[PDB]
Symmetry: C2
Subunit: 85 residues, 2 copies
């Protein structure tokens, strides 16, 4: 089975996000006062050979942990997956 | 009426993605041969006041275009929205 696994890495709610803060202040706020907040993060999407959706998702979380794609104390992650082909 | 609008910006399929290429080569490939590809992008999430889901998403689309959050000739964008509160 081939899975498309998405990994979204963002800052925890209580940790300052300089990119989102800056974009909101100098770009978004000027464009529209209907957009009240901007949070920024990293998006990584993987193609994964696996035996199940669980195996694919857990594999990516392990990657994120072991290979330090994020810092558990300041960042939070979200993993979404879907079978493809 | 509040909407959570996600904006994912990635490179078009035919345009080199240096981050994805590099992560795959030096980090992912080393971690697991079951992860065959990595594509990288930016993730931005906005909280938007709007009268409809359409108004909220088109507004973020306009933001992305007018304020140059991406280059349409080399980047692709995906917008997802969900009502909150």
């Amino acid at each position: 089975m081939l899975y498309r696994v998405e990994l979204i890495i963002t800052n925890k709610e209580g940790v300052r996000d300089p990119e989102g803060e800056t974009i909101q202040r100098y770009v978004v706020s000027r464009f529209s006062d209907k957009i009240i907040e901007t949070r920024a993060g990293k998006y990584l999407v993987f193609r994964v050979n696996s035996s199940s959706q669980q195996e694919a998702t857990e594999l990516v979380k392990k990657l994120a942990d072991e290979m330090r794609l994020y810092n558990p104390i300041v960042h939070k992650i979200e993993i979404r997956a879907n079978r493809i082909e």
